[PDB]
């Protein structure tokens, strides 16, 4: 069991725990978690966040052969649960740090946005150029490990990152939102971030 081994106290998540394109799990819609959460579901959230921090540490990422990341979704660990972790650094130490259970976008702006540099994915071993078109702004509802409900409004990079992870729990990949015809086309109402 993926969640079983990953939740072991001694286990440290690394690239070998992350599945890549081709694995059906990434195109499957993750199942919602029920409350109260099991101890394993809470630990998994914590393990995920620990992974993000490790991936962001120079020495850690190096020793563990980790690809840097600011977000991670359970499906990427072959665990089909609606659980995601986000850790966006400020340029406190973080612009956004959260472990979200059953996250859901309850409202979004008409205006769209996309990173000028485009996007990458820990489960995708290749570069796919293009603007990943997303909602500029979103209001997201989610539950924390204690089952408490949170409603937040995101913009800029945080908005992009959370949408990328929520897409994972819905079986969607970043390149699914890039314009096939013109990967770098700038449509009306599209806000390029940079």
Ligand X SMILES: OCN(O)CCCc1ccccc1
Asked if 121 is part of the footprint of ligand X (rule: CB under 6 A), the reply reads yes
- In this structure, what token pair is assigned to residue 140? 């997201």
Distance CA 143, CA 42 (A): 12
Name the segment binding ligand X (CB under 6 A); options: 6-14, 43-51, 87-95, 118-126.
Answer: 118-126
Nearest to 161 by CA among 130, 126, 120: 120
- In this structure, what token pair is assigned to residue 151? 């409603």
Spatial contact of 174 and 129, defined as CB atoms under 8 Å apart: no
Mask for 28-67, x = binds ligand X (CB under 6 A): ----------------------------------------
In sequence order, the 6+-apart residues with CB closer than 8 A to the CB of 70 are 52, 56, 86, 87, 88, 89, 161
Q: Among 119, 165, 180, 194, which one carries the catalytic annotation?
A: 165
Asked if 72 is part of the footprint of ligand X (rule: CB under 6 A), the reply reads yes
Residue 152, CA distances (Å) to 71, 107, 127 in order? 17, 10, 31
Question: Which listed option, Ni ion, ligand X, none, makes contact with residue 33 (CB within 5 to 8 Å by class)?
Answer: none
Asked if 81 is part of the footprint of ligand X (rule: CB under 6 A), the reply reads no
| Annotation says 97 is catalytic | no
Q: Is residue 121 a known part of a binding site?
A: yes
Asked if 165 is part of the footprint of ligand X (rule: CB under 6 A), the reply reads yes
Of the candidate residues 6, 42, 74, 121, the single one contacting Ni ion (CB under 5 A)? 121
Task: Supply the DSSP symbol for 77.
Answer: G
Question: Which listed option, Ni ion, ligand X, none, makes contact with residue 80 (CB within 5 to 8 Å by class)?
Answer: none
Spatial contact of 121 and 132, defined as CB atoms under 8 Å apart: no
Q: Which is nearer to ligand X, 43 or 83 (CB)?
A: 83
Residues catalogued as catalytic: 165
Q: Which residue ranges make up the site for Ni ion (CB under 5 A)?
A: 121
Binding residues for Fe cation: 121, 164, 168
């Amino acid at each position: 069991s993926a969640i079983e081994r990953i939740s072991k106290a001694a286990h440290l998540i690394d690239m070998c725990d992350i599945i890549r394109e081709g694995n059906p799990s990434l195109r499957t819609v993750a199942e919602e978690v029920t409350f109260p959460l099991s101890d394993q579901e809470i630990i998994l959230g914590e393990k995920m966040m620990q992974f993000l921090k490790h991936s962001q540490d120079p020495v850690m990422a190096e020793k563990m052969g980790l690809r840097g990341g600011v977000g991670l979704a359970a499906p990427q660990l072959d665990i089909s649960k609606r659980i995601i972790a986000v850790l966006v650094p400020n340029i406190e130490a973080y612009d956004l740090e959260a472990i979200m259970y059953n996250p859901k976008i309850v409202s979004h702006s008409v205006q769209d946005a996309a990173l000028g540099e485009g996007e990458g994915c820990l489960s995708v071993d290749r570069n796919v150029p293009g603007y990943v078109v997303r909602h500029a702004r979103v209001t997201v509802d989610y539950f924390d490990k204690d089952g408490e409900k949170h409603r937040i409004k995101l913009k800029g990079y945080n908005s992009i990152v959370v949408q990328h992870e929520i897409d994972h729990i819905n079986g969607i990949m970043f390149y699914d939102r890039i314009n096939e015809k013109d990967p770098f086309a700038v449509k009306d109402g599209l806000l390029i971030l940079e």
